[PDB]
Write a protein that binds this ligand. Structure first.
Ligand SMILES: O=C(O)CNS(=O)(=O)c1cc2c(cc1O)C(=O)c1ccccc1C2=O
Ligand SMILES: O=C(O)CNS(=O)(=O)c1cc2c(cc1O)C(=O)c1ccccc1C2=O
Ligand SMILES: O=P(O)(O)OC[C@H]1O[C@](O)(COP(=O)(O)O)[C@@H](O)[C@@H]1O
Ligand SMILES: O=P(O)(O)OC[C@H]1O[C@](O)(COP(=O)(O)O)[C@@H](O)[C@@H]1O
Ligand SMILES: O=P(O)(O)OC[C@H]1O[C@](O)(COP(=O)(O)O)[C@@H](O)[C@@H]1O
Ligand SMILES: O=P(O)(O)OC[C@H]1O[C@](O)(COP(=O)(O)O)[C@@H](O)[C@@H]1O
Ligand SMILES: O=C([O-])C(=O)[O-]
Ligand SMILES: O=C([O-])C(=O)[O-]
Ligand SMILES: O=C([O-])C(=O)[O-]
Ligand SMILES: O=C([O-])C(=O)[O-]
Ligand SMILES: [K+]
Ligand SMILES: [K+]
Ligand SMILES: [K+]
Ligand SMILES: [K+]
Ligand SMILES: [Mg+2]
Ligand SMILES: [Mg+2]
Ligand SMILES: [Mg+2]
Ligand SMILES: [Mg+2]
Lengths: 434, 425, 425, 418
């Protein structure tokens, strides 16, 4: 009460009733559950990304525009089906639908393109090598590598991407007992992980999949690397317009577990309700994110994270701590590769991480990190570097004010570096919105 | 031994943080403990055969639900008789006999304001046929619970009333409903139509948490393994839903169409049994017990005081079980509210209490049938010995195990006050 | 119930705090201590406190252990002091409200390498005169304790050896010394000369913490109320020092020159009594009990398992006392290690155990000398009732209070396995 | 490792105590300020120079004794001794001057009005107001300091039952508190003073306001060269309780060993500060501190969190009034708070806040404000290196503002030394 009394007088009682704030202020996890309220509405923008598998039900440019508006952040192309010609047309339709909103920063919404490989079916397959080369040639952002069983499998995928695919992210799919057992070595060499529950549920007893999902999500959260929860999340929506009680619960629990992304497979690739499936995941993720017990989560991420002498890492924890202290509406970060936004995201701030970048690939790939909202800055550089920096911060403060994220009177945390180029983030500023 | 500490997610249970607890979960760590979350199976055309109900009892069914929204009193009386016939077909082996509670799920009020006239007739049918529990549909306020209690009359004083929360009013008036109810059912089917579907998980977790705090049974119900009505295996979302209901703190999990009308009634029970054992081992008891202790108020009731001392003692020695003598089941319920990892073996002479304690997680009822000894202390020991012998036969106990024994100072209900540390011989 | 006034006394608002910082903020000078003083006072007996009349005044002021410093005087001098202590103690054997057992402790002169020749003669004197405790000077390694143990000859294996840590070697080899000792004395006088004076507080807090972890008695000694050797009131630093030794976790606090040679021996005892009562109420039991619990390893010893269950039960109902039957004092010691707020009333037939349990904080001994009953269960009930009657007589209990009773299942030492919740009638 | 780092890494307070090591040496600079009462035993300029070297940070003038002429000579001798080290600006130590009032005796007395006026005329930094028993007593002292004494700090002395009972209202209107144990131990039972001390220290820590522990801390050292075991324990426990300052009264004013008493408090405080269980302390201070929309308050918590993440050697903060350094100090960082200020009064007063090391900036301004700021930050680094706080390769947190003037702190920077 006294630790929120002056902020309650300032922001009002109605502010503290929304986005499960009474449940977030609880002293125990049990009290946190007791304080969850169906009448407490989510205010924050949805932070868990939705990956939609693109197929016959979601191929058209008009349908893809509907899915972008519904919340799709990553388009998945399953190379276990179709052909190179089929997937190239899908890629072109996604890019056409994405560029139909390029007229403004207030309307632009980047969509990453992910290639899900067919898999080994011994080691790296010959069609996997051909498909990975297709991905490099078509400019894919992410590879969902099927049946990764050891660290050498991810090294083989990296080698097959060649020197031109150095920027592509490799998300290793854990689909069998070997992948689960060798998880630490796979995560160490991967950019992220996908909990591929379809095959995992056949390879290990179905009643043990939840243990593997929660363990992998927890370790990925500890490592600060993206983790995707996949397969049968809203399965019944392939034929029905509404999901089952188990399905909405599953989506909410994947977000509560700590998943950075949630996925739709047949629900969007072949189902009768692809847009509705995206809308449903969007709705559940917004509710589940507000119900996250940040008080224990942030304390545990701080206690578990080792000490660091990397200024980006040090600035990120100071910025997230500052954002929680004032209930900052957003954390605006300037990033080239997306790394500074990723280091902010690993501490799970409630404040939106608005990442301003000049890299179109980084803007698409940061969708893998929960709570990161990418803004592609296209303006030519200013003669004075410090003015160019300030212009990019103001671009985020304007796009944020104008897209609801921010309001006059709000506090924002601004994360920048001391010199140009990747790797120099070391400054945190507290700014009041006017 | 080292192998003991690698099983039942003991490395994950020893973790200092919840995050480290999740990281330490092991798919190769096998569950050793008996399944403690009760399975309620709805009876219907797919599960009325005496021989099919015997298979469901062996699979793990603990409570048989009679849905009074379907069928006549004649139909429900036959369900009751077939359940009792299947249950009594195992009474020849008293150390391995499993009591099965009978629950009457009411039709509800409909466009009505309170207790319907059909509900009054069905509630009286339940009292006349000896039902143990009432799952009262669409409870919206405390006066709805009082009307159900009044309709049960003086002969139904022992029947438990589990209020079903199925709409926004029930969720908003939850505290007053829980106060006058014996427990709650999160009726997700109607709740998911009455409130936005994407909010049901918030209502489920809130109600389970409050019930855990109150020490009253909470049931998670509807569509848990829905696809198993026609398919032999459930979806990844369904197994996750069952596991998460157990992790949330549900005392009971339910099957509706999966057992009443589906093609896999036995397999649906076996699947819930398998998931619940895995999920119970993954419970982070270190935080859970500390939070239940911190939140529970001080008490001057000896049953309540003995229960917390016994659960604390069970954790200190990794007791295989807590054997409790109970008349009404209340001493077992007060042990269960602290969520011990040790099984609560409840020895009772009341067949109704033996059936009703299935509402409390981790309570394993043993119905004692022997005629009393003339010396009271000798009769209490004979029942404790019966608890140990059944525990050994069922795999709960072995020679060398430590067990906590909970008894009272005089006969009759309400006098539990002793906790003793016992070594199994 | 208990009333609002009950919850304002003995720093109960500060004890209910969720953080240690909030606990400090809630400390109230107007919140009066209700509980009996639980930290024992050791008074050094010398010229200023040698007379039978003066010793009677010191017993009334709160002296629990009489220390005889064998660094001064002779065997003849100390034998007269022992006889005067026993005479003063027995002058209250008619009044059950005034009778209090007083332990007799021999503080050795000290070492050279191994045990000194004078220490062998003095330890032999202690065995012949029936001393209860040995404060072994300058213990530096485990072999020093073994030498004292061997010197305690065939008739003295029951005497307790409290090793005095007085130098850098004793501090560095602390774990091996504590392992073989019955307890520790933080001998700050020599320690403050052997190591830098500004480091003594680190050694005191470390040794007290480790002793609390081990469940072994720890004494805080030297210059606690030094100025009271010549002045009737202590300094602000002295009262703070006594209070902080109690807050650190000391089982005993000591007076040296303050009682042996000073002008105000009775007043020094009265002052330590007054400060310890205040400091014990200010102990943050919520964190302390949770940390003692979390740090203590799992145990398969029924005495250790019963002790934690009993202390948990005592906290749950705000038990007025924990009555324990003990022949060696071990069951009372295992209760004391969990630092209950309830008084541990130890009923024993052993006069030596009754004197030695003063080393354990919160243990209030009662020597029982009635002839044994033919039925053991009746003999147990008679001693439990003796503990309740003495409790009512001394102010610990009233009709309507709840107590926790700790007994075992069969006679003789080592079988404590029972905890009962009893209502005072 | 050094500075009780194994004990600081412990998961419980019990294991923290068990891990305390007498062989683990303190590395960090002493954070708890020492207030020494100046009198006949510590009046000479030569004696005062030795007390400054021993660790004296605040000179207390007890207006219950002596005269205005006597105390004016003491003030002049303190200033003379302090300025005798001004030739080396990177290692010069500011010393605050505090006036302890006589008190009301049998409201604000007429002698107190004259003494408070003396303090304003002589430029004192702090007032230790005797026998404060309600918020209106603080207001009367504030009024008696007139318009020329707006910048003096008022530390209310709690010396009786009424002051203890009305503590919250007194702390609300005061700059800080002094636990005046001498009178408090006569006004309330002696065995209850420790409860009042620990309660007041805790509440002051919560409020982020300075708290002084005073009277009889090393009493025996008035006549003996070494203190008793109870005295060293008392000093260590006042620091462990959370006191920002510790005081010497008769030990320095009339005692045979004034320099040794200061040296002893310095030695004990360094040991006690290393034994502080920061893991629990920071988590409790952070949890208890309310949410804030003030950028100085928000930057302060972000900076302390960042300092703990990298084991920052120091937090260099630019301050005009000392407020930005005070807001850093309230979170009890292990990193030294090096406060670079151009105000000489702020530099002296900032000794009331634990862990704040004031550096008086006596360098000429740079034309560009961004450059003036960078030279004040380089000044902090250079003094830190010279005084042993910093080494090349160390990480520091730099707390600066967006525009000049008090109240605009909003920037935290992670900087690598050289
Ligand atoms: O992993 C699985 O096997 C199932 N799930 S899916 O990846 O979402 C999926 C992908 C696809 C199609 C359906 C479908 O459900 C499809 O009809 C199709 C038809 C023609 C070409 C490609 C596809 C194609 O890639
Ligand atoms: O040495 C320490 O550790 C502390 N000193 S003490 O043990 O409290 C102490 C004991 C004694 C006397 C004084 C005194 O201070 C005494 O005068 C005396 C006179 C004649 C015979 C015995 C004593 C005797 O035992
Ligand atoms: O997040 P990354 O990839 O490390 O890049 C962050 C970088 O962006 C900046 O804020 C601005 O740099 P640029 O001028 O290269 O865009 C740098 O100061 C910082 O090093
Ligand atoms: O849990 P309940 O219903 O309160 O029953 C516990 C009761 O059972 C007993 O242990 C045994 O009593 P009975 O001999 O009547 O079965 C009583 O001492 C105790 O009061
Ligand atoms: O603390 P100790 O020395 O183990 O004594 C406890 C013993 O006292 C008893 O409670 C009673 O024993 P006695 O009848 O022999 O005195 C035993 O059952 C128990 O083992
Ligand atoms: O501690 P204070 O009193 O708030 O002052 C800190 C001030 O120091 C600055 O960093 C620089 O101070 P100057 O006015 O001396 O340039 C300001 O931007 C900031 O407001
Ligand atoms: O391979 C997959 O994507 C799966 O099994 O879910
Ligand atoms: O009544 C039920 O079981 C429901 O609505 O879910
Ligand atoms: O003997 C003692 O007590 C000492 O040396 O402190
Ligand atoms: O003036 C003081 O400091 C006191 O009275 O304690
Ligand atoms: K695939
Ligand atoms: K029904
Ligand atoms: K001695
Ligand atoms: K004064
Ligand atoms: Mg697959
Ligand atoms: Mg329904
Ligand atoms: Mg000695
Ligand atoms: Mg005074």
């Amino acid at each position: 009460r006294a630790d929120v009394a002056q902020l309650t007088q300032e922001l009002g009682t109605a502010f503290f009733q929304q986005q499960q704030l009474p449940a977030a202020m609880a002293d125990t996890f049990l009290e946190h559950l007791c304080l969850l309220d169906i009448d407490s509405e989510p205010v924050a923008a949805r932070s868990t990304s939705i990956i939609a598998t693109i197929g016959p039900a979601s191929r058209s440019v008009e349908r893809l525009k509907e899915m972008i508006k519904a919340g799709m952040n990553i388009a998945r192309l399953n190379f276990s089906h179709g052909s190179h010609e089929y997937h190239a047309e899908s890629i072109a339709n996604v890019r056409e639908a994405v560029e139909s909103f390029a007229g403004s920063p207030l309307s632009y919404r980047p969509v990453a393109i992910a290639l899900d490989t067919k898999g080994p079916g011994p080691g790296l397959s010959e069609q996997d090598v051909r498909d990975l080369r297709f991905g490099v040639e078509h400019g894919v952002d992410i590879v969902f590598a099927s049946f990764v069983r050891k660290a050498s499998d991810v090294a083989a995928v990296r080698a097959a991407l060649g020197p031109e695919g150095h920027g592509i992210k490799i998300i290793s799919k854990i689909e069998n007992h070997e992948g689960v057992k060798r998880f630490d070595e796979i995560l160490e060499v991967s950019d992220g992980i996908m909990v591929a529950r379809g095959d995992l549920g056949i390879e290990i007893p179905a009643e043990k999949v939840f243990l593997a999902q929660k363990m992998m999500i927890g370790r990925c959260n500890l490592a600060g690397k993206p983790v995707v929860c996949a397969t049968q999340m809203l399965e019944s929506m392939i034929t029905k317009p509404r999901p089952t009680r188990a399905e909405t619960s599953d989506v909410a629990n994947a977000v509560l577990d700590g998943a950075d992304c949630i996925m739709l497979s047949g629900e969007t690739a072949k189902g009768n309700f692809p847009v509705e499936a995206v809308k449903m995941q969007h709705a559940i993720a917004r509710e589940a994110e507000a119900a996250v017990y940040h008080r224990q989560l942030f304390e545990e991420l701080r206690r578990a994270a080792p000490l660091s002498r990397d200024p980006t890492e040090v600035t990120a924890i100071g910025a997230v701590e500052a954002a929680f202290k004032c209930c900052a509406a957003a954390i605006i970060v300037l990033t080239t590769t997306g790394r500074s936004a990723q280091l902010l995201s690993r501490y799970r701030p409630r404040a939106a991480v608005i990442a301003v970048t000049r890299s179109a690939q980084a803007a698409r790939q940061v969708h893998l990190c929960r709570g990161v909202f990418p803004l592609l800055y296209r303006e030519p550089p200013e003669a004075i570097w410090a003015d160019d920096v300030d212009r990019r911060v103001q671009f985020g403060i304007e796009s944020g004010k104008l897209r609801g994220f921010l309001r006059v009177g709000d506090l924002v945390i601004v994360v920048t570096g001391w010199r140009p180029g990747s790797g120099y983030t070391n400054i945190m500023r507290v700014l009041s919105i006017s």
